[PDB]
Amino acid sequence: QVQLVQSGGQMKKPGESMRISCRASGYEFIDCTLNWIRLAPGKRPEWMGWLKPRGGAVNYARPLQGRVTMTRDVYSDTAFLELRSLTVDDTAVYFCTRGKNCDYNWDFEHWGRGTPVIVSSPSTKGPSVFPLAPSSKSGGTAALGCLVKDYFPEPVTVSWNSGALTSGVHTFPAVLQSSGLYSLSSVVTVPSSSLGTQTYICNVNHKPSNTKVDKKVEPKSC
Amino acid sequence: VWKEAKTTLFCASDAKAYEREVHNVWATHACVPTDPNPQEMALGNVTENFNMWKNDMVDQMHEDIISLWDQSLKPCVKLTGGSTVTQACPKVSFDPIPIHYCAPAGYAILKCNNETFEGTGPCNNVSTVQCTHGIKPVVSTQLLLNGSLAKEEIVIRSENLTDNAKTIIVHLKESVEIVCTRPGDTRQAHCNISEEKWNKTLQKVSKILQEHFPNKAIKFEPHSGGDLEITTHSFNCRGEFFYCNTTKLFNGTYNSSNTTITLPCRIKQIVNMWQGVGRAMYAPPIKGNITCKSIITGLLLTRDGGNDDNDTETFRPGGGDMRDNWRSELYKYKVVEIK
Amino acid sequence: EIVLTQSPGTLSLSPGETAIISCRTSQYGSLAWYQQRPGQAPRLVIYSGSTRAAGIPDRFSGSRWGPDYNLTISNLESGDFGVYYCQQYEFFGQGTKVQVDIKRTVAAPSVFIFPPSDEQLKSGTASVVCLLNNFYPREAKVQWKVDNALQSGNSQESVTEQDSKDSTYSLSSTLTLSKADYEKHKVYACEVTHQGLRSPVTKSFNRGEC
Numbered sequence: 042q043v044q045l046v047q048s049g050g051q052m053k054k055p056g057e058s059m060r061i062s063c064r065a066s067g068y069e070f071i072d073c074t075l076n077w078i079r080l081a082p083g084k085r086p087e088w089m090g091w092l093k094p095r096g097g098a099v100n101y102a103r104p105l106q107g108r109v110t111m112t113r114d115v116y117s118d119t120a121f122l123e124l125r126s127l128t129v130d131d132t133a134v135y136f137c138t139r140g141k142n143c144d145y146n147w148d149f150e151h152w153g154r155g156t157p158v159i160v161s162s163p164s165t166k167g168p169s170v171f172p173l174a175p176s177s178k179s180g181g182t183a184a185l186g187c188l189v190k191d192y193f194p195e196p197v198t199v200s201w202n203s204g205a206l207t208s209g210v211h212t213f214p215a216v217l218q219s220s221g222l223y224s225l226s227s228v229v230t231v232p233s234s235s236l237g238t239q240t241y242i243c244n245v246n247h248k249p250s251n252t253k254v255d256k257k258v259e260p261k262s263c
Numbered sequence: 264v265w266k267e268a269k270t271t272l273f274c275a276s277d278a279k280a281y282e283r284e285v286h287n288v289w290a291t292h293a294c295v296p297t298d299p300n301p302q303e304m305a306l307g308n309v310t311e312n313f314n315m316w317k318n319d320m321v322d323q324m325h326e327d328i329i330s331l332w333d334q335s336l337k338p339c340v341k342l343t344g345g346s347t348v349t350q351a352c353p354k355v356s357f358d359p360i361p362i363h364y365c366a367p368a369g370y371a372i373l374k375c376n377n378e379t380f381e382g383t384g385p386c387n388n389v390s391t392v393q394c395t396h397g398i399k400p401v402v403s404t405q406l407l408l409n410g411s412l413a414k415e416e417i418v419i420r421s422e423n424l425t426d427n428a429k430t431i432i433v434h435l436k437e438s439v440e441i442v443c444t445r446p447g448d449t450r451q452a453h454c455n456i457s458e459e460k461w462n463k464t465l466q467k468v469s470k471i472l473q474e475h476f477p478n479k480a481i482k483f484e485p486h487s488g489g490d491l492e493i494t495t496h497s498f499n500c501r502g503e504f505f506y507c508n509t510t511k512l513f514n515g516t517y518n519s520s521n522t523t524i525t526l527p528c529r530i531k532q533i534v535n536m537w538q539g540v541g542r543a544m545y546a547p548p549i550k551g552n553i554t555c556k557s558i559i560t561g562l563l564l565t566r567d568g569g570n571d572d573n574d575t576e577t578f579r580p581g582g583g584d585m586r587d588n589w590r591s592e593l594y595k596y597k598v599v600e601i602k
Numbered sequence: 603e604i605v606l607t608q609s610p611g612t613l614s615l616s617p618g619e620t621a622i623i624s625c626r627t628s629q630y631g632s633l634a635w636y637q638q639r640p641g642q643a644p645r646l647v648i649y650s651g652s653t654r655a656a657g658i659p660d661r662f663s664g665s666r667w668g669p670d671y672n673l674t675i676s677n678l679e680s681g682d683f684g685v686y687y688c689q690q691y692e693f694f695g696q697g698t699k700v701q702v703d704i705k706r707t708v709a710a711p712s713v714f715i716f717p718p719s720d721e722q723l724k725s726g727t728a729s730v731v732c733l734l735n736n737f738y739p740r741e742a743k744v745q746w747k748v749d750n751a752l753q754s755g756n757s758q759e760s761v762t763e764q765d766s767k768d769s770t771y772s773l774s775s776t777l778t779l780s781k782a783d784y785e786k787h788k789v790y791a792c793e794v795t796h797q798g799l800r801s802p803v804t805k806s807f808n809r810g811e812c
């Protein structure tokens with residue numbers, strides 16, 4: 042009954058290093074190979090390297106060489122993983138794995154339950170709220186909304202008319218742009234006729250930067 | 264006559280009754296004297312399959328050498344996890360002798376005469392013997408010493424070359440002499456290898472690898488990490504445990520008054536046991552010049568994994584599991600049954 | 603050169619349907635499939651192409667047709683939803699997210715386009731927004747065209763989760779340009795294709811017009 046037991050989750054900052062352990066039981070520690078795999082959401086799961094506890098023999102994946110170290114304590118059946126020079130992109134859940142049988146490394150039947158590592162900066166930016174004005178040209182009804190651009194980190198909440206307007210509202214999942222900031226649009230479909238008479242206020246909140254912003258969306262004057 | 268089977272083989276070797284040397288004393292009780300006229304029987308239009316990586320002969324030999332070392336090389340202290348045992352550790356005379364493995368009555372051993380055979384798969388030229396050739400049980404890492412040599416061309420062996428977790432065994436055709444010496448700080452030693460011989464052999468190994476990894480650049484680099492036993496070329500000379508820095512042996516790309524490569528070595532008394540889990544402390548070294556003139560007849564390699572731009576394949580010295588050292592010599596043999 | 607391509611990215615199915623996930627590979631090597639239920643360690647499903655791991659029901663099957671490996675999941679249950687990865691030695695596929703979908707009538711999208719606010723353009727960046735509202739099924743494609751010229755890698759789609767009340771989806775593709783690239787060109791438009799439209803719907807605007 043093979044068992045891999047990893048250490049708890051950690052939080053780091055860009056530049057620091059981290060160590061994770063993984064204790065094996067149920068089998069002869071030195072007769073089988075261990076691996077470290079990490080899964081960053083939105084990315085391929087990445088094999089980081091393998092370790093043969095017998096001699097401590099190690100094989101690191103090319104992109105991680107220089108930043109990664111794998112050791113093991115043979116007398117307590119525990120593998121270790123160190124990763125230094127951490128950047129934001131090192132945010133992932135890290136796993137130790139072991140093959141189905143000890144002949145073939147790669148059929149990973151056995152996984153620890155993972156160690157979350159969040160690598161984040163304490164810098165926060167407030168969002169720019171731009172209006173998505175309804176066309177003066179006009180299926181059946183009209184659309185309008187807010188463009189919440191360039192904030193960090195998530196989440197941003199958006200409400201309409203202080204929450205009295207909920208029907209027909211869509212707040213889209215945030216997008217992580219190239220800049221490293223998030224962006225989302227919030228929209229709502231309203232009767233095309235009551236456009237110039239009814240007030241429509243976009244209420245955007247962003248707790249990390251203590252920013253409350255109320256934007257009034259209206260069609261341009263010509 | 265293929266009938267792959269499991270039997271307890273018996274060892275054979277030419278031990279001396281007078282010799283107090285530890286391999287000799289062990290062989291005196293464990294083994295039998297060598298058959299003066301050993302018979303070989305050829306097999307025409309006979310083709311059979313072998314697997315060097317799954318062979319019971321390797322495990323039998325492994326158990327023997329383990330139990331040899333246990334009786335012969337007594338450490339002052341042996342510490343295991345939390346337990347500890349301390350016995351008398353006198354100095355001993357130490358120099359491996361060739362051991363033959365033989366099939367008992369009813370069984371026999373298949374020899375493969377395909378001199379380009381890579382260890383697995385079908386073999387076209389097959390014969391039958393009762394005993395293997397003389398094998399020196401040399402315990403070492405990174406470099407295979409005092410072994411047999413490939414007789415047609417350099418052979419690369421791996422259970423799967425595309426599998427980066429499988430060890431690569433290079434079987435040389437031309438041997439490279441390595442001389443190690445501790446001169447009479449007294450723990451510092453040094454190895455000497457010719458550049459011409461060594462450079463050339465890695466050039467030649469680069470070329471064979473290029474055929475197995477087309478459109479890739481071949482590059483050698485030093486060991487990635489682990490215990491000193493495997494990050495250095497380690498080996499036992501005359502009872503003493505040597506640990507030699509092999510960085511200079513692996514310096515990148517090998518293209519196509521003599522000048523020598525001096526590898527810096529140390530003699531240690533606190534040693535990790537290759538037999539199993541445990542640290543062993545042996546006696547301080549003896550006095551005088553402690554010298555080994557050995558021959559390098561093979562390498563243990565490990566290929567780098569992970570995504571690669573530049574189209575470059577990188578190889579590093581391996582070792583650690585000694586079963587590998589034995590299969591480098593037992594690859595051409597399989598134990599069969601008669602019927 | 604990873605050369606282990608998994609597709610499709612997202613698979614929206616119902617319970618009882620069957621999931622068909624694929625993986626191309628030119629390389630020699632054994633292939634395995636893993637399943638990651640939300641918030642859990644991945645688990646081995648198929649190894650060596652078609653061999654089911656232990657505890658894995660007959661509903662899961664693997665096949666191989668040249669370089670093309672397939673993972674077929676029949677009689678889809680709720681415990682089967684998650685992300686699936688193919689693996690060959692040290693490499694993994696991008697992942698395929700199979701997620702629940704509720705069946706309903708096909709509904710064409712309502713399309714709206716939004717020019718960048720002038721308040722924004724004082725910042726040197728232009729954000730055009732195309733909104734596809736309340737459609738079904740989920741599969742939809744938005745293409746940007748600036749003066750009859752298709753755009754490459756300068757837009758980002760964003761999809762809401764299927765609505766609990768009317769089972770529809772909503773998509774938001776945002777095209778971003780520097781103010782400079784926006785000062786040039788007159789016409790901006792998004793071209794929407796869907797299962798509920800006989801022919802693509804395009805909504806446009808001339809720059810500076812109202």
Ligand SMILES: *[C@@H]1O[C@H](CO)[C@@H](O)[C@H](O)[C@H]1NC(C)=O
Pocket residue numbers: 377378379380381384385386387
């Ligand atoms: C054995 O020799 C044959 C030629 O007689 C050669 O073609 C073959 O490749 C060599 N054996 C193997 C399996 O490598």
Ligand SMILES: *[C@@H]1O[C@H](CO)[C@@H](O)[C@H](O)[C@H]1NC(C)=O
Pocket residue numbers: 305376377378388390
């Ligand atoms: C098998 O073939 C080789 C040629 O590759 C030949 O020289 C040899 O005599 C044969 N094996 C033996 C030793 O009978």
Ligand SMILES: *[C@@H]1O[C@H](CO)[C@@H](O)[C@H](O)[C@H]1NC(C)=O
Pocket residue numbers: 458459462514515516517
């Ligand atoms: C040996 O190989 C090295 C590779 O680094 C090279 O620089 C050197 O010229 C070679 N020396 C010779 C020719 O013995």
Ligand SMILES: *[C@@H]1O[C@H](CO)[C@@H](O)[C@H](O)[C@H]1NC(C)=O
Pocket residue numbers: 508509510
């Ligand atoms: C091995 O020798 C090389 C020579 O360049 C040196 O860099 C390295 O530190 C040595 N290994 C150790 C850790 O002694």
Ligand SMILES: *[C@@H]1O[C@H](CO)[C@@H](O)[C@H](O)[C@H]1NC(C)=O
Pocket residue numbers: 511514515
């Ligand atoms: C090793 O490589 C360096 C270049 O990186 C070269 O200058 C040097 O000559 C090489 N050393 C040997 C073994 O000749």
Ligand SMILES: *[C@@H]1O[C@H](CO)[C@@H](O)[C@H](O)[C@H]1NC(C)=O
Pocket residue numbers: 516517518519
């Ligand atoms: C040897 O290797 C070097 C590495 O850059 C390369 O520039 C050179 O062309 C090679 N020479 C050959 C292929 O003979």
Ligand SMILES: *[C@@H]1O[C@H](CO)[C@@H](O)[C@H](O)[C@H]1NC(C)=O
Pocket residue numbers: 358359401408409498499500501555556557558
């Ligand atoms: C290799 O063999 C020679 C004698 O042939 C011996 O002097 C030397 O000690 C051996 N090397 C080792 C490490 O056994």
Ligand SMILES: *[C@@H]1O[C@H](CO)[C@@H](O)[C@H](O)[C@H]1NC(C)=O
Pocket residue numbers: 383422423426630631632
């Ligand atoms: C080599 O690896 C493949 C999978 O890539 C495996 O199916 C096969 O058994 C291996 N071949 C040998 C010689 O064992």
